[PDB]
Amino acid sequence: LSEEDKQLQDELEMLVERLGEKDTSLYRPALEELRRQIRSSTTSMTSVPKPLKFLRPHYGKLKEIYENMAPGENKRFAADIISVLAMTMSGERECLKYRLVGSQEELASWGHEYVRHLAGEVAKEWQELDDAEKVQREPLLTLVKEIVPYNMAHNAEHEACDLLMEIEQVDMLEKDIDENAYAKVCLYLTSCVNYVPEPENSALLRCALGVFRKFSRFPEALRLALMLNDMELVEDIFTSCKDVVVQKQMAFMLGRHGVFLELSEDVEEYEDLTEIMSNVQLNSNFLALARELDIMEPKVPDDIYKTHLENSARMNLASSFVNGFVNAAFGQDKLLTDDGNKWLYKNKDHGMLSAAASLGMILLWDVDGGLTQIDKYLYSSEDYIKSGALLACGIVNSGVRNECDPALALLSDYVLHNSNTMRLGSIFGLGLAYAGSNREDVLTLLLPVMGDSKSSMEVAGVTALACGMIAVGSCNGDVTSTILQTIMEKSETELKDTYARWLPLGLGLNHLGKGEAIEAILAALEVVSEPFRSFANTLVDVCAYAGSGNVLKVQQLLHICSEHFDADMGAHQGVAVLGIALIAMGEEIGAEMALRTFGHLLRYGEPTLRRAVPLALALISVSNPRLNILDTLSKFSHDADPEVSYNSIFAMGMVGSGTNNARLAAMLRQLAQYHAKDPNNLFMVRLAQGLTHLGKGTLTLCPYHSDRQLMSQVAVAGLLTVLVSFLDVRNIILGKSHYVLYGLVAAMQPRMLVTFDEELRPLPVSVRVGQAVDVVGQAGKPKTITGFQTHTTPVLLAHGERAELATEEFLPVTPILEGFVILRKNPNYDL
């Protein structure tokens, strides 16, 4: 027993004796010392007064002192000691109570560990307090107006967000946000938006939006606005800024997301602002990029196939995709521009449909020049070539929104053309040409096509697909009425056709990411017959929660996969598997947690359930050639089930889409040898080889940009169109309808880092490119990249690779160094 410890043990009696005297003259010196006695051990975080822990039973002698008389100074310091004794035990409605009723001095005077327990209490009791207890939060609010300023002072900022998120009072944070912690507070709660549910989903973003708006951080304010798909807030964010240099950067970000803004002519620099966001200069910027990467040389599919190292209508049609994919959006090809007639006519039947349309894909984003080349095939007498050239115009204008509209003009005259093939090349052309536009002009011109008597189910599906791309995530009322109308007007036998599966996607596309706005729509799907209703109900519900990660919805999806049927009744099971990927593609934690569940569907599953899980892997990790999925797919390329073999190989290509992975190409080359005598499997192998060398490695199909935080409506539409068509790979992809593989044209974007001057001209500087590192939590300045290297700016960024400027010569307009970035001279630099 230490004498100093015994000295405090004496205060358990003699100081209480001083507080036991009737006169108040001895009350204050003992209590004031007792109040300071706590601070004596509070100066050390580990040191606590153990004799004080023996004073807990002594509160009975002090019970009347802090309760039975005036609260001036007798109860003031008497209760606070009990509060100090209250973090030692459970502290249910006690630690706060002596704090609430006792002294109302500065909170931090009692210790950082005390308030941390005190802060943990105020949230715990907040949930317990009901509506009738609103009179009980008067001192409760005062603490949080002082707890939050205390937390930011000692770099314990992340605890501050934890306080007012629990009490659902995130609003008051912005008033006390300082310049030294605005990024740290935003970076933390924005990372919580991937898991917290509605209504705290939007609300947490709104508070982060307010902080950025308050601190004039416009580029990162606009990023938050798009994530909330607030059409109104986008205009307010855009026009609030006065720095015109700052504003053109948004149009680059806004154009990359595919959302159009109709600015007023009164806005200064109106022209270039529209030009930048309309991606009209994307072709020149893309072409100038690859000129710096000296890959302008066209590539033959043989250079991709590498058959010289290897120890038909399908072959010619397969190589048409491999041709176009490799030099997509490049404008030059050694195989189609140079006497294309022999190659194009070397294909047969619907092979010429895709072969002709492949010419529009090598002119992707080349709206002006690309239209100059398809016209030669636009006058072809053969039914397929013109219609293939029709869809080629839509591919050419896909992803580019120019002011005056060519694509509608060249294809409007053919949406009611008597031959279905001529029609077929029209709607899919318009769908790609105006994906993510919500333009009523094209929609109203396209809407009666689905209701036509001459329109077959093949034409009926593409109209829903196309109209879905134009009105993706818009919840357009007009398209919902007609898509529902068509769905129930079709027969029981008519819905048996797998092309009928596309009508729900058009309805599902319209509500992409909208959430709970489907209960009215889902009620309408009740009236339609089975098993199409179960498929339609599952699909549209999935597209509703795309990129949301709502586990409750995924809980329903796994239950649909749980009950197996001894095909026809289990067609909907494939969509549920694709649903898990489409829902969990939001955050990394959910996506990787979904990979293991995909393996179990890949183990306990039935054929129709197991045929779609390769597609889920492609959607969940497109353009992300991670080894875990590739090895999972590699084992299952040579599977007994033909569709699983077909789907897995295609998934490998889409997983490595545009990555130009040397390891993946070696696997695909080996798969070509294994599947040489299987034309169907080899067609999938050939299809994958074209995708992995997409755009000569300068393009990506990943729907996410802005540090994998922004969801692109058009890209998911392009992907969903392809993978939902792959649920019947025998009849659609391998059949006569392989033009649906041109849906991913809507998902083609360049993995770009081009830094521009304030006058939009190229500005090559040294940058650091490496794998991104989470910067949540740890204070100070933690590095956000690991295993990084230094390149000049016009470099292709792989999935998950962040970029930081190596030097400080230029201050980026936006922290996110992706796509086109405007650089400004740093005034402190070269002081």
Q: Contact residues for other proteins (CB under 8 A)? A: 113, 116-117, 119-120, 123, 159, 162, 306, 308-311, 599-600, 602-603, 635, 662, 768, 788-790, 806
Q: Which residues contact 471 (CB under 8 A, 6 or more apart)?
A: 438, 443, 479, 509, 510
Q: Which is nearer to other proteins, 351 or 794 (CB)?
A: 794
Residue 655, classified by CB atoms within 10 Å of its CB into exposed (0-12), middle (13-18) or buried (19+), is buried
CB 790, min distance to other proteins, A: 5
The minimum distance between CB 311 and other proteins, in angstroms, equals 5
Strands 810-812, 819-825: pairing is antiparallel
- What is the DSSP code string of 403-414? SS-SHHHHHHTT
- Give the shortest CB-47-to-other proteins separation in angstroms: 17
Per the rule left: phi > 0, alpha: psi between -120 and 50, beta: everything else, 399 is left
Of 791, 715, 792, 790, the residue nearest 750 (C-alpha) = 715
Which residue, 37 or 597, has its beta carbon nearer to other proteins?
597
The smaller minimum CB distance to other proteins, of residues 67 and 310, is found at 310
Query: Taking the complex as a whole, how short is the minimal distance between the CB of residue 117 and other proteins, in angstroms?
Result: 7
Which residue number, 117 or 439, has a Cβ lying nearer to other proteins? 117
Q: Which is nearer to other proteins, 1 or 662 (CB)?
A: 662
Of 301, 380, 292, 288, nearest in space to 329 by CA: 288
**Based on CB atoms, which residue is closest to other proteins, 365 or 636?**
636
Give residue 465's identity as a one-letter amino acid code.
L
Q: 26 vs 806, which CB is nearer to other proteins?
A: 806
Q: Which of 691, 688, 681, 591 is nearest to 641 (CA)?
A: 681
- We find the least distance from the C-beta atom of residue 37 to other proteins, in angstroms, to be 24
Nearer to other proteins by Cβ, of 540 and 602: the residue is 602
Residue number with CB closer to other proteins (108 or 806): 806
CA dihedral sign, ordered 680, 685, 686, 688: positive
Nearer to other proteins, 497 or 639 (CB): 639
**Is residue 542 a contact partner of residue 587, using CB atoms and an 8 Å limit?**
no
Q: How far is the CB of 124 from other proteins (least distance, A)?
A: 9
C-alpha span between 548 and 585 (Å, rounded): 8
Of 342 and 603, the one with the shorter C-beta distance to other proteins is 603
We find the least distance from the C-beta atom of residue 162 to other proteins, in angstroms, to be 7
Q: What is the DSSP string of 192-219?
A: HTTTS-TTHHHHHHHHHHHHHHHTT-HH
User: Shortest gap between Cβ of 768 and other proteins (angstroms)?
Assistant: 8
d(CA 776, CA 563): 41
Helices (H), 605-741: 607-610, 613-620, 627-635, 642-655, 662-674, 679-692, 713-725
Query: 90: number of CA atoms within 13 Å, CB side?
Result: 3
Beta bridge partners of 791: 767
Whether 802 and 785 have beta carbons less than 8 Å apart is answered as yes
Tell me the C-alpha distance between 206 and 203, whole Å: 5
Minimal distance, residue 82 CB to other proteins, in Å: 21
Structure tokens at 163: 């306080």
Percent helix, percent strand, percent coil in the chain, to nearest 5: 60, 5, 35
Q: Which is nearer to other proteins, 438 or 659 (CB)?
A: 659
Nearer to other proteins by Cβ, of 239 and 792: the residue is 792
Rounded Cα distance, 298 and 518, in Å: 47
- Least distance from C-beta 641 to other proteins, angstroms? 12
Question: Given the complex with other proteins, which of 124 and 376 has the nearer CB atom?
Answer: 124
Least distance between other proteins and beta carbon 789 (Å):
5
Tell which residue, 621, 710, 560, 729, has the closest CA to residue 234: 710
CB of 765: closest distance to other proteins in angstroms? Answer: 13
Closest distance to other proteins from the beta carbon of 51 (Å): 24
Among candidate residues 686, 692, 695, 802, the one with its CA nearest the CA of residue 748: 695
Give Cα separations from 564 to 7, 559, 571, 610, 823 (angstroms): 75, 10, 11, 11, 57
**CB closer to other proteins, 199 vs 787:** 787
Distance (Å) of CA 236 to CA 220, 241, 243, 261: 14, 9, 15, 11
Furthest CA-CA distance within the chain = 114
Q: List the 810-812 sheet strands across, edge first.
A: 753-756, 819-825, 810-812
Give residue 286's Cα distance to chain centre.
24
Least CB distance from residue 104 to other proteins, whole Å? 23
Block residue for tokens 């007064």: 49
Residue 306 C-beta: closest distance to other proteins, Å: 6
Whether 277 contacts 252, CB under 8 Å: yes
C-alpha to C-alpha distances, 446 to 259, 340, 482, nearest whole angstrom: 21, 31, 11
Amino acid (one-letter) located at 560: I
| Closer CB to other proteins, 184 or 768, in the complex | 768
Least Å distance, CB 116 to other proteins, is 6
The nearer residue to other proteins, 93 or 306, going by C-beta atoms, is: 306
Closest separation in Å from C-beta 13 to other proteins: 33
**Looking at beta carbons only, is 311 or 381 nearer to other proteins?**
311
What is the spatial distance between Cα 654 and Cα 649, in angstroms, rounded to a whole number? Answer: 9
Q: After which residues do gaps appear in the chain, with C to N over 2.5 Å?
A: 311, 566
Q: How far is residue 771's CA from residue 807's CA, in Å, rounded to a whole number?
A: 19
Least distance in angstroms from the C-beta of 309 to other proteins: 5
